[PDB]
Amino acid sequence: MRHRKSGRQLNRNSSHRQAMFRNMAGSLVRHEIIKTTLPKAKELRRVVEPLITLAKTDSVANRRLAFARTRDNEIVAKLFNELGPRFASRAGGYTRILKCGFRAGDNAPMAYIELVDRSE
Amino acid sequence: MIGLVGKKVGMTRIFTEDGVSIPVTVIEVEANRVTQVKDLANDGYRAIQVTTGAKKANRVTKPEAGHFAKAGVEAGRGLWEFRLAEGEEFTVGQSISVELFADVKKVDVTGTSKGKGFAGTVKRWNMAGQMGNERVTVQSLDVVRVDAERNLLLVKGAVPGATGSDLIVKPAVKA
RNA sequence: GAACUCGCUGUGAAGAUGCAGUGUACCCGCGGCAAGAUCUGCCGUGGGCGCUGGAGAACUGAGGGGGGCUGCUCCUAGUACGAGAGGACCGGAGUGGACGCAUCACUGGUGUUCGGGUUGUCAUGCCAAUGGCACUGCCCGGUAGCUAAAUGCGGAAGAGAUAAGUGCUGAAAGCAUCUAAGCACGAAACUUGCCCCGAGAUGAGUUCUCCCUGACCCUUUAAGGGUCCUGAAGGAACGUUGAAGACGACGACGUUGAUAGGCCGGGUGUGAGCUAACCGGUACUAAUGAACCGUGAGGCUUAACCU
RNA sequence: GUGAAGAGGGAAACAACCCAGACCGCCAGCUAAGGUCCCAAAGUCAUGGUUAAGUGGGAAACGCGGAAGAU
RNA sequence: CCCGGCGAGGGGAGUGAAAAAGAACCUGAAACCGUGUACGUACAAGCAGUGGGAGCACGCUUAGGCGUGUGACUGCGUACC
Secondary structure, eight states, X not given: OOSSOOSOOOOSOHHHHHHHHHHHHHHHHHHSEEEEOHHHHHHHHHXXXXXXXXXXXXXXXXXXXXXXXXXXXXXXXXXXXXXXXXXXXXXXXXXXXXXEEEETTTTEEEEEXXXXXXXX | OOOEEEEEEEEEEEEOSSXXXXXXXXXXXXXXXXEEEOOTTTTSSXXXXXEOSOOOTTTSOHHHHHHHHHHTSOOOSOOEEEEOOSSOOOOTTOEEOSGGGTTTSOOEEEEOOOOOOOBOHHHHTOOOXXXXXXXXXXXXXXXXXXXXXXXXXXXXXXXXXXXXXXXEEEOOOOO
C-alpha cells in the first residue's frame, strides 16, 4: 500500500469510474481537446493512450474491442482511419497536457489535454 | 576483516547441489574502491570508508567532487564505513570483491526492509509508528554460492534488503 | 482567577505540576496512544534557532533501547567415581518449540486496475457481435505487490569484574587458619562481547572537500552603523517522479535524458487474441530558459614556531 | 500556652514542637532558640576520650544479636 | 478630478472655525484585535512578584554615574472569597 502502485485511487464506484473514464475519453477524442483537472487529467491520458496506440492496427477484432470500450459508432468510424495515419511516425506520447491555473468556483486545478499535432 | 556493499538483485529458492530447492539470496558484488583510511592519530581511530557504484556528476556537487578527488576515485552511490581488523592496512584506490569470503561461512548481512507506510495501531500493535525501512542485524548466515565471475554473492536463506536497496555484508565474528 | 501548566522522594482536612530535597529537558507545531481530552503523560514526524565565515557530506562517540528462553540424542558413557547396584565433569555437534527481524522464489490466500464462462433487462437501423444496471450481477483462474499456512538468523562462544563458596604456603598463640605475611579459583547474578537511535551530549565532538579575497560615507567610536556594486560555494519552490510519505520530510531525474507517461520486444496470467502493476530498448510526450535565499576574509585574550 | 483574633526566626516543608508579641523608616551593632565543610552565615577552633560500625544518619521488647520498610 | 466594478469605499481640491465635525456624523476611556517604536528571551523548571542588578537607546548636572522602557541573574516568596 502507498508503494509501487499504478493509477490514483480517485475514490468512487469501480463501474462508475470506468464509465466516467469511457465518457471522458470519448468527449476528448470527439472535441480533440478537453479541460480536466490534473489528478483526472493524468488518468485520462494513461487510459486514452492505449486506445490510440491500438488504433494503429486495423482489424475486425481491434475495431470490435474499440467499439466495446467506446460504445459510440461515430467515434469508432472516425478511428483507425485518421488518428492512425496522422501519428504513424510517432510511437507514444500522442497527447500533451498544459496546466491552466485553478478553477475559481472550488479552487480546482485545471489542465488542457490535446493531441500533439492538434491540427492538420 | 573487510566488508562489501552492494544491492539485492533478488531472492529465490534455487536447487542445491544435491538437487533440492533451498532458499538463497542474490546479492551483487560491486568493486568497492577504497577512498579514505582513518588513523588513530589524526582522527582517533583506524577504519576504511569506501564507495560503491558510479553516479552521474550532476547529482554530485563540486565540494563532493573535490572530496572524491582527494580520495582519488570517482564519486559513486555514497560512502560506507568499515572497521579495520587492527592489523594490516590497505591502500587508497584499490577495489575488492567477494574473493576470500568463502572461508568463514558465518558472514553477516545488513540492510533495510520493505517500504511500509505509517501503519495504524490495530494493524501494527493489535501508538502510531513505522515498521521496516530500518537497518537489520540478522547474523549467523552461511554462504551458498561464491561465484566471483558473475560478481554475485549468495547466502543461505533471505536477505534484509528491499528491491534495489543498498546493503552490506561483513565477515562476522558472532554465531 | 491567572499561568513562564516536567518526573521521583518527604510532609500534607491523607495520590501535591505550584510546599522542602533531588534528577531531566533547545523554543514552537502535525498525527496517534487515553495513564491522570481543555491540559499534563508516551510514540512517529516537522518549522525557527545554536553549535562563532558559509555550505556539503563521512564518522569517533558519552548516553539511552532491543536479549541473555528452552526439550531430546550422539563418541564421551553402564566409563571414571562407586563394596555390588547405581552412575559424570561432558556442556563439542545435530535436532523441535514461544518471539523478533527479512523476503514472496517454492505451499498457497488476497490481489473489485488482467483474461474467460454466463442469467434478466436496455442500447448499436436488424442477425452475429459488443456496452450499462442487477454487491465486481453471479462464478473460473490470476500479473506485480502484501500476506502466514513457507523458510532464512538467532538467544552464542569468549573476556573483565564478582557475592556466597572453594582454596597453594603460613604465625600471632613450637598447632590450626581464606589473611595477620606471600596470596588464587569461583553464580546462570553485573558489564562487555551483536545491533538500533545517538554531538540540542548547550560539555553542542573529529575527518575531508568547495566558495566568498570590492569600494565609499557617517557616528555617541566599535565583535559600530549605513550606501552602490557584487549574489560566490551551497540550499530550497517550482517540472517528471519513487519500492519515502496522513501533512511534513528523504531519494532519483530535469534536454550534457530513461525520472514519469506511451510504443516495440521478452515473460506471466487468462485461454489464436487482451495483458494492469514483471524485465531490456526507445525522447514520441512531459520534464526548460529562468527567478529566490545565501558572501565580500571571519571578533577578543594567552603560549610555541620565521620574521 | 497556641490558633481563634501575632507577625517573624529554627527544625525539609509540617495548624498544634522550640525561641519570640511587628507604630514607621534607616545598606549600624548586640543577642533568644538554632547553627559555625559548603549549598546557606558563621571555628574544618582547643583540651581527653568513645565511635572503624557509615552505627552515626530508624526502629521496640527480649537474649553484640534483635535490624525486616518505605518500590 | 482620480482610483475603484458604470457599485460600495477611499484619496486629492474646495466649502466648512474645525471634515482629529462627513450623513454609523458632540466630546470618544477601558475590556477585545493590529502595526511601529526601545529591551529581554530558543540549556531553562513551579501563584510569575518582591529588594539588589551589569547591559542595552534617549534627555539630563552637556560626563560627575539622575530618570525614563525592560530585566540575564541573584536570596525570598504554597491566589481571593
